[PDB]
Write a protein that binds this ligand. Structure first.
Ligand SMILES: [Mg+2]
Ligand SMILES: [Mg+2]
Length: 260
């Protein structure tokens, strides 16, 4: 188990499994050649399931969301090591979006309506947009109805089709969904955008052989291939450590969220 021949690699189900797998094929092939190991991918049904599988010691690498990383780290022997870098920044934002047909173009128009969030353990499709709504005196179950639709693509689709009047999701995913034709830009209005949060961490099992750990980190750092990272509109990977996610811990405290 310190130097396995094949690596079990989990990817966050932030969108449909097909989409996540397809976007990662380039990276998988690169890493298999760089490391001379076979990679075997796993995409869970939901974020909590991925956390559980990490906590049980089944994974060698895992591409977590920021919040789901913080949660896993409480009960898993894992460490973050890399994150996507774009135009020199290693952060991303959440959006609050509204249904255009219903004229949902401000926070005031959310009141008394349906707000879609993704997975309960989502940073950019739950915690962050919820915080943004709270700062605008909107409170779930008091002056709006919340629905958890389980993923970012599910949020965008729900808002675009008017099943939900507003929603919160990843800015990069929203962009990708528009660029790929999945979402019609004319059917949604951007209401607000969040402050920058740290990018998703790539993580590894901490009891992998120290030489292998370095090889893995170095492999990510060495990647110079805009084509491989094109699905993520990214330049390169940079380094990250556990402390970079303290901002997410702090937000989780602010909102008094109970994952236990
Ligand atoms: Mg493979
Ligand atoms: Mg699911």
């Amino acid at each position: 188990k310190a130097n396995p021949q094949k690596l079990v690699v989990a990817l966050l189900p932030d969108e449909s499994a097909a989409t996540v797998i397809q976007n990662n094929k380039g990276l998988e092939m690169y890493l298999e050649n760089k490391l001379n190991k076979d990679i075997e991918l796993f995409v869970s049904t939901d974020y909590s399931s991925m956390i559980e599988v990490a906590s049980k010691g089944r994974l060698d690498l895992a591409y977590f969301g920021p919040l789901s990383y913080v949660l896993a780290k409480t009960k898993s022997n894992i460490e973050p090591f890399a994150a996507l870098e774009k135009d020199g920044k290693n952060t991303y934002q959440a959006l609050v979006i509204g249904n255009a047909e219903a004229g949902i173009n401000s926070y005031e128009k959310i009141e008394g309506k349906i707000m879609a969030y993704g997975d309960q353990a989502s940073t950019s499709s739950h915690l962050i947009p919820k915080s943004m709504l709270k700062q605008k005196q909107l409170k779930a179950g008091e002056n709006y109805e919340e629905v958890f639709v389980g993923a970012h693509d599910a949020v965008a689709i729900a808002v675009a089709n008017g099943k939900a009047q507003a929603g919160g999701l990843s800015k990069p995913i929203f962009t990708a969904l528009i660029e790929r034709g999945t979402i019609d830009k004319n059917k949604v209005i951007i209401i607000a955008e969040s402050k920058p949060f740290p990018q998703y961490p790539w993580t590894m099992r901490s009891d992998l052989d120290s030489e292998l750990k370095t090889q893995i980190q170095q492999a990510f750092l060495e990647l110079e291939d805009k084509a491989i990272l094109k699905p993520f509109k990214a330049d390169a990977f940079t380094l990250v450590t556990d402390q970079d996610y303290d901002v997410v811990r702090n937000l989780g405290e602010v909102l008094e969220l109970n994952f236990e």
